A paper describes a structure:
Incubation of the HKU1-A spike protein with the receptor analogue 9-O-Ac-Neu5Ac-α2,8-Neu5Ac-Lc-biotin led to marked conformational changes yielding a surprising heterogeneity in structures. We identified and modelled three distinct conformations: a fully closed state (3.8 Å resolution), a partially opened state with a single S1B domain rotated upwards by 101° (1-up, 5 Å resolution) and a fully opened state (3-up, 3.7 Å resolution). We show that glycan receptor binding by S1A specifically prompts a conformational transition of S1B domains into 1- and eventually 3-up positions, apparently through an allosteric mechanism. Whereas this motion leaves the S1B–S1B interface unaltered, it has a profound effect on the S1A–S1B contact area, displacing interfacing residues by approximately 8 Å. This reshaping of the S1A–S1B interface seems to be the key phenomenon from which subsequent upward rotation of the first S1B domain follows, involving a 101° rotation and raising the tip of the S1B2 subdomain by 50 Å. The apparent absence of particles in a ‘2-up’ conformation might be explained by the fact that a lone downward-oriented S1B lacks any such stabilizing interactions with neighbouring S1B domains, probably making this a transient intermediate.
Coronavirus spike proteins mediate receptor binding and membrane fusion, making them prime targets for neutralizing antibodies. The spike protomer can be divided into an amino- and carboxy-terminal region designated S1 and S2, respectively. Distinct S1 domains mediate receptor binding, whereas S2 comprises the fusion machinery. In HKU1 and OC43, attachment to 9-O-Ac-sialosides occurs through a well-conserved receptor-binding site located in spike protein domain S1A.
Numbering used by the authors:
A (entry chain A): 653 to 748, 765 to 818
B (entry chain A): 211 to 321
C (entry chain B): 819 to 894, 904 to 1150
D (entry chain A): 985 to 1222
E (entry chain C): 598 to 652
F (entry chain A): 101 to 155
Amino acid sequence: FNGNIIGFKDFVTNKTYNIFPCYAGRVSAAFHQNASSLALLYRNLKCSYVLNNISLATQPYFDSYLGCVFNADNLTDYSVSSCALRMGSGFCVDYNSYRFVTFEPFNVSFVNDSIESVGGLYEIKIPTNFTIVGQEEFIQTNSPKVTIDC
Amino acid sequence: AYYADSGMPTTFLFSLYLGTLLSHYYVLPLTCNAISSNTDNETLQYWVTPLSKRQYLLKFDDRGVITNAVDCSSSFFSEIQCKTKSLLPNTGVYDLSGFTVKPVATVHRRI
Amino acid sequence: SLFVCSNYAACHDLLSEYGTFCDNINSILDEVNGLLDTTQLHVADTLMQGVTLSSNLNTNLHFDVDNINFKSLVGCRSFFEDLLFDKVKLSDVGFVEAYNNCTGGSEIRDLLCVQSFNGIKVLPPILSESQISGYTTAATVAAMFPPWSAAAGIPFSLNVQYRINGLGVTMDVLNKNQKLIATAFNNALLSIQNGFSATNSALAKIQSVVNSNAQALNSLLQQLFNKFGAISSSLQEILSRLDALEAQVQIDRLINGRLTALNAYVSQQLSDISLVKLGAALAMEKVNECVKSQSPRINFCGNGNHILSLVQNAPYGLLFMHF
Amino acid sequence: LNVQYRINGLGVTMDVLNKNQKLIATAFNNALLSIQNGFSATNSALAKIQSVVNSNAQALNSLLQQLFNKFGAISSSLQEILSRLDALEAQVQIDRLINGRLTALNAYVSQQLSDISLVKLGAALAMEKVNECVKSQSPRINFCGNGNHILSLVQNAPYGLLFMHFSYKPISFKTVLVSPGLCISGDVGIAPKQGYFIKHNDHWMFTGSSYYYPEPISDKNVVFMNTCSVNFTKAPLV
Amino acid sequence: GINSGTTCSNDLLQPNTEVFTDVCVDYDLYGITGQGIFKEVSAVYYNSWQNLLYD
Amino acid sequence: GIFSRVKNTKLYVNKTLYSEFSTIVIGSVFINNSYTIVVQPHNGVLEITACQYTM
Ligand SMILES: CC(=O)N[C@H]1[C@H]([C@H](O)[C@H](O)COC(C)=O)O[C@@](O[C@H](CO)[C@@H](O)[C@@H]2O[C@@](O)(C(=O)O)C[C@H](O)[C@H]2NC(C)=O)(C(=O)O)C[C@@H]1O
Ligand SMILES: *[C@@H]1O[C@H](CO)[C@@H](O[C@@H]2O[C@H](CO)[C@@H](O)[C@H](O)[C@H]2NC(C)=O)[C@H](O)[C@H]1NC(C)=O
Ligand SMILES: *[C@@H]1O[C@H](CO)[C@@H](O)[C@H](O)[C@H]1NC(C)=O
Ligand SMILES: *[C@@H]1O[C@H](CO)[C@@H](O)[C@H](O)[C@H]1NC(C)=O
Ligand SMILES: *[C@@H]1O[C@H](CO)[C@@H](O)[C@H](O)[C@H]1NC(C)=O
Ligand SMILES: *[C@@H]1O[C@H](CO)[C@@H](O)[C@H](O)[C@H]1NC(C)=O
Ligand SMILES: *[C@@H]1O[C@H](CO)[C@@H](O)[C@H](O)[C@H]1NC(C)=O
Ligand SMILES: *[C@@H]1O[C@H](CO)[C@@H](O)[C@H](O)[C@H]1NC(C)=O
């Protein structure tokens, strides 16, 4: 529709073609100050296809739902509470070397109690101490009054 | 032409407009008796590495001396760090687009 | 480095003199994605609250109280959001899958990956919809089960009873038809899940916003094919049949036309994410004045006499159900 | 008295804290000293104001190098161009060069329009905050402070206003066996407007919604009910 | 070597003037043109081949 | 272009310390034209003979 090529035929053997365009460009990388190595991520592309493109990387491949992550052992057993190097879809990497640990920001405390009306009554973990805490917040209300001579 | 016997970075000597493209380099033989002295003394150690078009980083200190240099062409840590104006970049997920496959052999448009 | 010029070194040399401008555009992209992720975490911790639920939870054993069904909206992935995910296939998970089909094979009409092959990449959001839907399910079952953190420690039927106290309705006729009004909510829930088969206004706006996004992407696709006063639109033929000095005016006119197209697009994107921030903040406001605790502000949560509301996860947004 | 009546609305009884006004006064001044020492740590608010000043400083810095970009022109310094080329050969690049300068200017004022609109909306949000939970206390939760927000006070800031908030959050809890709502032998329901009901020592006592305190049952702490539901707790006698 | 170097066109004869400090004047320092103010300072980081400082 | 890295050859003749290394020629065709380049060291001092003489 928008003038985009699809395929051709040969005038010799009269067989057709589908010209899917090729791929170029890298994806991303990850770095930390106290680390010294690099964490490489190659999303939306197969690890075996990446290794068949040029050569075999020094770090072993790790294929994920996102893609091919390098130099990081995937570890979904533990969950990082607060990350700063976001891989996307709740995923992150960190240095102690570099390894891949799934990320969740928040969780529910999961109080070990009942669920139903025991004798028509409920087990609620009500507070017994009185404690307050101040809260810090800022709202920007003003901007510097810039000008320019045209 | 550049040399610096003292100080590990090199400095300017002179420029020389020729126009003729320079093509070949050779080291002369020195007809000398024994600089090695039955391989018990020193020898000659000219080492060579070619140059080409690259963009680098030139870090200056308070006294205007070249502190460090970054290739920005070999590794992936060669880039990012030098494009973030530091010897050591901050944490972040920085994208890369420094690779193109270019495996082609035939380019024609014909009737 | 890929869009305005793909791979041509003589072209990239003329890109290199003015690469500071597109680097500034990339920094603009970085900060609008930073506000996008910041608003996503804002959504995450405003849906989150001081919630405690009992750790001995089983969604399949105990799932209903006083004969109101929730198995459409009970998750951990609920059927209620999965119906909407059946109604539209252009999710970010579907985007990732569509990137996964485009590695060789069939479907030569594959617009999403030839957008990626031309340069523009729809990044997935940093939070999966599975955990967001699980968070909304956790908030809903917190509202439905003791301790009622999302219902201020009050049972759900008691929330309905105490709300209908405050709306000019006495309790004398109410005490004999709890099952009748429970079936009234059940029939309302069946009606609103059955209404999604018809093209609703919610369906109209979700396909409107995703088709607007696709139309903007296709507008970027034809911007490569625009002349901008040049004799052609791409770099290979003008690098071939011209000698790059008479083609230099063609090159810089096409790259400044493309850069102005990106300036218009980043202005549109910053306006769009400002709208996203305003709509998001209004969503925060209506969440914490309807579902966490109802407020005496009339005719904003629901048209007419509002009683209560519920929030379900949606593709690229939240689905708000009001009663 | 203002803060005592304010935390009463959050579900706290007054009998315990009549003896405990001194230690919550120390909690007040310790919270102020903690947030005063909170600015010694690089917290979010200092990061926010530093982000604002670095953002518009970087914007006005990026305005400078738009003079120094190459564009299609052979240089960026017009002075050496006019000392290098004649006036007739100036306009072959300088007219579209200054056109690029003006496109940079009107683009820059378009982002200025966007940021002034969003900071006007931020000023409106700050206005809503200061007239709903600074000069008064509105029934609207999780808007000024997270959790049980008590009240807020506003201090002056450079290019903004600092919004410090008093919030209530206890440190220890206690399990208890309670029931929300019940009824009596005269088929009259008993249900808390705030809090729960504890049964101990063969009598049914009343507790608050934020602290374990068994209070004697009364008619002023309760909302009346004509008939209780069949799925409610039945209490004999009065 | 545009407006910089040693080969000076003396077709228009101009006498070499001392550096008038602390005034807003135009300068022709060995062919380097512009307009600005010079303040007499002290520097030690300069080298034999190095004569200009850049920002 | 090329980069060279030459460790000094500190040979110590008795009470006459020397540091002498080899001689390099660079050029295009190395004839009586094309500006042939010959640089040699002579015991602490370099001698550049960069002229289009015969080879
Ligand atoms: C590049 C290389 O392989 N250099 C050799 C070098 C040459 O093979 C050779 O000297 C040049 O003459 C030819 C083309 O045959 O030889 C070195 O070893 C010599 C062996 O010929 C060594 O024995 C030298 O022999 C002399 O007899 C001589 O004049 O040839 C005496 C001289 O003092 C002696 N040099 C010493 C001991 O250093 C060489 O000259 O060192 C070995 C090089 O690696
Ligand atoms: C009080 O409410 C509970 C919870 O709803 C009732 O217990 C079950 O409720 C479900 C759904 O309403 C029914 O399908 C079950 O048959 C109920 N179980 C039993 C044993 O009744 C409970 O019945 C209610 N009690 C009264 C008196 O209404
Ligand atoms: C097939 O190709 C031949 C030449 O290779 C051509 O002459 C012919 O027309 C084509 N089509 C058919 C149907 O044979
Ligand atoms: C890195 O090392 C420094 C210096 O010891 C230390 O202060 C810091 O806590 C370490 N970790 C990070 C994340 O910076
Ligand atoms: C890590 O990834 C590999 C493949 O990339 C997978 O087989 C393995 O199960 C993963 N480990 C987990 C999910 O713990
Ligand atoms: C509540 O917490 C405070 C915190 O220091 C503690 O001193 C006090 O003993 C606790 N208990 C009561 C009943 O106040
Ligand atoms: C992607 O598309 C191909 C071709 O239609 C298909 O064979 C494959 O199953 C698809 N992938 C998934 C995950 O369905
Ligand atoms: C060049 O002209 C100047 C006058 O501006 C004159 O003083 C000088 O002698 C001339 N140089 C010659 C003739 O070599």
